[PDB]
Every structure is written in structure tokens, then in C-alpha cells.
Symmetry: C2
Subunit: 97 residues, 2 copies
């Protein structure tokens, strides 16, 4: 028996989320943001990424609703309070010790 289109739907969404997490630098980002608030520049020096590239990664994380922001003047502070991210990171830390 073939799978019901709803299962396909679920798999599609889950895959979108996982894909948002399925990148090394993005993973480092989510780790760091889960543990603290950071300015984009500081993030750039923490994952060793350029401002443009990191801003794109952050945009893709925003696309999946994986990060939150607060504004102070010209500086934006990113953080992560996504249950999903913490669950996945938890599983990952259970796997690789």
C-alpha cells in the first residue's frame, strides 16, 4: 500500500525544518544562539563567516521560524528559543556524546 498524501505532507515539512538545520555553520549558529543572544558581527567572528553569508544563513533560519530578534539602535540581537531546535540539538548531543 502507498503512503497517504498527508504523510507526504508531514515528511515535506519535517524535511524543510531539518534542511534548515542540515548545514555545519548553521548548526554552529543555532547552538550559539540557543545558548545566548548575539550581535550579527559577533556571530560572524564566532563561526568565522563573512557578514553577507551569515546574514543569508540567518535569513534562512528566519524563513523556518528558527530564530528570534530584538533591536537596539543599529544593532540586532539574535537568539533561539525554538523547542524544535533544542530537541534536534539534544538528540545530536545524545548521538555524538
Amino acid at each position: 500500500q502507498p503512503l497517504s498524501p498527508e504523510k507526504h505532507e508531514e515528511a515535506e515539512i519535517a524535511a524543510g525544518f531539518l534542511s534548515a538545520m542540515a548545514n555545519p555553520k548553521r548548526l554552529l549558529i543555532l547552538d550559539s544562539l540557543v545558548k545566548e543572544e548575539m550581535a550579527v558581527g559577533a556571530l560572524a567572528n564566532k563561526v568565522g563567516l563573512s557578514q553577507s553569508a551569515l546574514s543569508q544563513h540567518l535569513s534562512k533560519l528566519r524563513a523556518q521560524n528558527l530564530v528570534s530578534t530584538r533591536r537596539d539602535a543599529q544593532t540586532i540581537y539574535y537568539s533561539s528559543s525554538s523547542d524544535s531546535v533544542m530537541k534536534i540539538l539534544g538528540a545530536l548531543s545524545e548521538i555524538y556524546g
Copy 2:
């Protein structure tokens, strides 16, 4: 100030794994294979995939060592007994109910 190259590597491996899982059809596949043994044809007909495409996806799953194979000479049976896969799927099913 920046993350240690060791952390970069950890992130690389974890991201490689997640990338292996970050696909809808592949997710359905890993679900089905985690819960039972199946022949390639049956898999192809339950996830709504062609033989070639499914064979390619399974090739990628094998590349990350997320599945095992058994031969009945003309028929090959795929299965999954990776704790990591079950952890990620567990988290996913914890999220989306």
C-alpha cells in the same frame, strides 16, 4: 572569539548526517525501514518513487551508513537499525505529534 576547528568538524559530521536525513522521500524511507524489512520494489511503491530515483536515495543512505542490506539472490532487502536515525525520527515525531 572564534570556535575551535574541532567544533567545525563536529558540525561538519552532524550536518552530513542531518543532510542525509533532510529529504521528504528519504524521511518516509527511513521511517518505513526503521519499522520493518522491505524489498526495493515495495519501497518504491509505498513512497511513490521510481526504481532509479529510489535506488539513488538508498545509495545516499548507504553512503552515510544509515541502512543495511540482505540478499535473497535476486531480491535485495533494506533495513535500518541506526540508533541515531531513531533518535532524530523520535524528536521529529515528538515535535509534529
